[PDB]
Structures are given as C-alpha cells and as structure tokens.
Scaffold this active site. Structure first.
Site, PDB file in Angstrom:
ATOM      1  N   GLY B  10       0.821  -1.199   0.000  1.00 36.37           N
ATOM      2  CA  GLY B  10       0.000   0.000   0.000  1.00 36.37           C
ATOM      3  C   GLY B  10       0.857   1.251   0.000  1.00 36.37           C
ATOM      4  CG  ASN B  11       4.677   0.826   1.826  1.00 36.92           C
ATOM      5  OD1 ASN B  11       4.566   0.100   0.837  1.00 36.92           O
ATOM      6  ND2 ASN B  11       5.439   0.506   2.862  1.00 36.92           N
ATOM      7  CE  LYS B 127      -0.175  -3.132   7.962  1.00 39.05           C
ATOM      8  NZ  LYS B 127      -0.074  -1.833   7.257  1.00 39.05           N
ATOM      9  CE  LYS B 208       3.060  -5.260   1.723  1.00 42.39           C
ATOM     10  NZ  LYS B 208       3.376  -4.665   3.055  1.00 42.39           N
ATOM     11  CE  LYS B 270       8.344  -6.326   3.404  1.00 39.78           C
ATOM     12  NZ  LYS B 270       7.226  -6.104   2.448  1.00 39.78           N
TER      13      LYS B 270
END
Lengths: 307, 307
Positions: B10-11, B127, B208, B270
């Site tokens: 999104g970023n 978040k 995500k 990640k």
C-alpha cells in the site's frame, strides 16, 4: 431453479439510522428473506444500490479535502461503497445461510459498468445522492459547483448523472461464479461508472435497477426482481380508482405509462427496466414487489410478461 | 506455469502523491511488471496492503463524524479500501493486458479473514496507519483514544492491531476463480478482520504479507512473492560486510535472524512470512525482491527454500 436477479435498494439499507451497525442489522432481515428464496431452490444473483451511502461518503471526502488527504472522485467512491455494502451484505447472508443450515458460498465482485460518454444524463444530473438538506444548506453547497433538487416534504439532495448501462466488464467472471453455484453480489451501487475501451472512470452513479437489468441479460437470468416497499404496483393510489396490477402484459404497462401513471422519480424507472428485460428474450419475466413478500412466496405479485 | 502470490504494498501504491489519480498512475507501472510475469506463462494471484489508504479514509470518517453521517469502523474501512484499491488495480491490469494483447480476466473478491480474538496484537497496536504527524499533532490525537508510534526521520503515525490470519473465508471461491484461469485480486488490505464462526468484524488491520502467506497455503501456490524496494536482501548494508543472500535456506535465515539483522518493523515480517510458507509444504518456495526485478526475470533474487 430459476435464476433471479434481485436489486436491493440503498435507501432501504439506510432507511433510518445511518450507522454501519444499523445498516448491517437491516441487512440481516433482508438476508433472511433472500435465504428463503434459496430454500425454494432458486438461484440468487444479488445486486444493490448505494444512494445514501455514497452521498455520505462523498461528504466525508469533502470534509477533509487537502493536498495530504485529497477527496476521492465519485467513481472511486462508488467502488468504496461496493466494498462497504458488499461486505455487510455478504456477512449477513453468511449468517443467515449458516443459521438456515444451507451451505452455499457468497462472493462480492467489484463491477465496472461501461456507459456512453455521450449520454444525456451527463447533462442532466438526476440521481438523488446523500442526505436531505434545507434549501439554505442546498444554496450554501450549490455554489460550490453542485446541483440539487427538491423532494417535496423532506428537503433537497445533491443530484448526479445516471447514465444507462451499456456493458458489464466482469460479466464473464460473474457468470462463471454462478455456474459454480456461488451466490454472487455484483453491480454494487449500479457499478463503477466507466467509459471507453480503456475503461476510463467517470463521475456518475448508475441506477441499480437498470444495471441489474443488464446483468440479467448478460447472465441469461430467468427473472428480474425489482423491489418496492409494497407488494403490488398501485395506480391512482389515494383516488377511488385505486387498483393493484397483479398479472400484467408489457402492452398493459405501456398503456398505464403513456397515461402518465408512473412518477418519473421512482416508479417509472422500475416499469421501464421491467419492460426492457421482458422484451430482451422470449421466455423472461420481471417481478415488482416487497422483499418481505418474496420472503413468503407462492404466487407472487406483479409479473410483467409477453410471450 | 507456477502459481505465484504477489503482495503489493500500500505504501508503494501511495509512496508520494496521495491523490486517486497518482495512485492509479502508479498502479499502471506495477501492472506492466505483473503482466510481464503472465507473458512468461505464470499464474498470478495478486494481493495488496492498504496502510496509508485506510488511514486517510479513517481521518475522513472522523472529520464528518455525526449522527447524520457516522464514521465507519475500521473493519468497514478496510472493506472500502478493498473496493477502491481493488478498482484501481483491476482497471490498470486490464489496461496493461489489453495493451500486451493478452486476454485474461481480472476479478477482485472482497475477502474476510478470520483471526483469533485473543491475539496479543489486540493489546499491542503496531500497524502504522495513515500519514506522518508531528509529535504535537500526535499528542492532539493521542488523547482522543488513539495510540501513535514514531518513525525516526519522518514523524509519528497512528498504530493499529495486526492480528495473525487464521483462515480466509472466501478461499474456496478464490481457488475456483484460479482454476478458471482468472487473475484474482484478494485479501485487500490484509483482508477484512473478522472473528468467530459468525464472522464478527473487529477493528484491526492484518499484514498483507501474512495474509498472502495464508492465501498461498489454502490456494496451494508454488511460490510466495514478498516485495521490497530492492532486489536481493542485503544484510550489513552500508558496512564493509554488505552481502547479497541470493539463494538461502530457512535455517540460514533463522541464523541471520537470531543476530537481529532484519529490522522488526519491515524486514523481520518479510523473513518470518517467507520461512513460514516454505515450512508449510514440501515443494514450496518464497521470493523476496523488487517488483521491477520481476518485470525483468530470468534467475531471480532471494529464494528461500528447504527440501
């Protein structure tokens, strides 16, 4: 059984309290009625409007408008309403299906509906969007580059262009889902207004009824369900000529139409959509009644036909 | 070919200009890279975050908060971002596919992701959501019943709970779409945070990467693609020890992990997501690289494995 395209009204979903909870709560009852049709072995192809929902959101967009937090144009707002309302409806249906012991899957698909850029509607904003305002407030906002129209009795609302549906981009995917016995929710808010081969988004709000009408065509549904608050379409309401329509022929509807019996605001679009659907294919039919009436079922109200 | 789950950030979508146009414009470039993978005969299972998008929307909700126009709770906000971002991405992919002469269908499905109500995350909002504020503004909003955390260098952001994904409600529908060779976009914004059998919506935002990881499992994808601004993971970056990982084993990553190499804010999640995926099934692999790098392709960067 019969493939039925049901068009849920946004003004019905938000008929009183404008809170998310109230709307979701409302959708629980409507879901109960919908599930009833499923119990009868019918195939549900659900859709829904977004009139009040998109207006409120649009206002929220304006309230914080800035470089750092810019307002999302109407086309993008419609997409958001597909998400919110879609979410609510889907959650509600799941609840009711689960409770009813029926195991069907429900999925909402973002739908982009193509329209003709040369549509007269772009010159005539008509779709009442958002809350009712006093003529004073209407004036205050009117000069900001917006048009408003009055509804005798409750106030003024911002009007937006409602172009006619030409094509439903995701139609193929929707159909595929239907073939796999999945309850589909599509054409949210009449569908995201799009134009051209590139599908360039435009600022407008399509009428759920006509969008559902196109879906019914592309999907080859058996019946198009147009919702109303009362079961049966009345003519000459308060007058001594009051009559319910029950079983009617397209020719019969045209007679009444020509005789100016349908108000251009609500009833006219209902009739036009119904007529258009029936005339598209040989063995098709359109129904106009209350969702509550469908929740009962047997020999239903207002069946427009010609065959 | 290989079924790949790609998680768009999104970023990344909103890395500069916060206007709908700028974001859509950015998605056109990303779509070009994605379509490239399709040219190579790969199966795309797209997903995306919503960090900045949802924060801006939330602010908009607060700006007009009233009885007549109430703020939509976070869960409903996520649903709206699934609609907006989904719309943009779908439109962009269509454009790029059309341009590339490839005829594939694209469909975004509203996704409700189940989480554990007793998740520690509900106690630890982490978040980062929305825009960067000065400590002063942070204080002004903090006392409104909101928590903020600082990012040394740019400012403070509102933090929200990020519970772990437990199940994806629409997984079956998604899988069906995949089997029909349709490019699916799901788990928008990590998915609408839901809890229990009734799927009661909760206020939170799922990561995500972890949502995509669950999707990859339930969908039985061949590879999970975690995006980064750079191709290849570089530990000890600006130091004389700068090294590229290229090909790595879960064990190796666990070793590098213990040494506190991967920043808990971005890199750590990640790595964790990648490791978890590879450890779920025997012949699976996780990739960590730039989307631009995928746009080229041949022998790609960072392949986490164990078999």
């Amino acid at each position: 059984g019969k493939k039925m395209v049901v068009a849920l009204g946004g003004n019905a979903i938000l008929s009183n309290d404008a809170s998310a909870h109230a709307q979701q709560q409302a959708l629980v009852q409507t879901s109960a009625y919908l599930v009833h049709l499923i119990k009868q072995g019918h195939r549900l192809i659900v859709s829904h409007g977004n009139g009040p929902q998109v207006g409120n959101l649009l206002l929220q967009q304006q309230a914080a408008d800035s470089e750092k937090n810019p307002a999302m144009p109407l086309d993008t707002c419609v997409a958001m309403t597909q998400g919110s309302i879609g979410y609510w409806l889907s959650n509600a249906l799941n609840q009711e299906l689960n409770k009813a012991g029926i195991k069907k899957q429900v999925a909402t698909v973002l739908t982009q509906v193509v329209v003709d850029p040369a549509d007269e509607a772009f010159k005539n904003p008509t779709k009442p969007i958002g809350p009712f305002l006093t003529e004073a407030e209407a004036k205050e906002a009117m000069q900001a580059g917006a048009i408003f129209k009055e509804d005798a009795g409750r106030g003024w609302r911002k009007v937006v262009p409602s172009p006619k549906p030409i094509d439903i981009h995701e139609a193929e995917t929707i159909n595929t889902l239907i073939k796999n016995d999945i309850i589909t929710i599509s054409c949210g808010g009449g569908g995201i207004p799009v134009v051209g081969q590139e599908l360039k988004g435009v600022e407008a709000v399509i009428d759920k009824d006509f969008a559902s009408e196109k879906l019914a065509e592309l999907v080859d549904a058996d019946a198009l369900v147009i919702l109303t608050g009362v079961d049966y379409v009345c003519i000459n309401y308060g007058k001594p000529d009051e009559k319910q329509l029950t079983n009617v022929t397209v020719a019969e509807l045209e007679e009444y139409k020509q005789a100016g019996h349908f108000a251009p605001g609500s009833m006219l679009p209902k009739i036009e959509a119904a007529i258009q659907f029936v005339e598209s294919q040989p063995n098709k039919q359109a129904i106009i009644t209350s969702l509550e009436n469908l929740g009962s079922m047997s020999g239903d109200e207002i069946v427009g036909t010609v065959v």
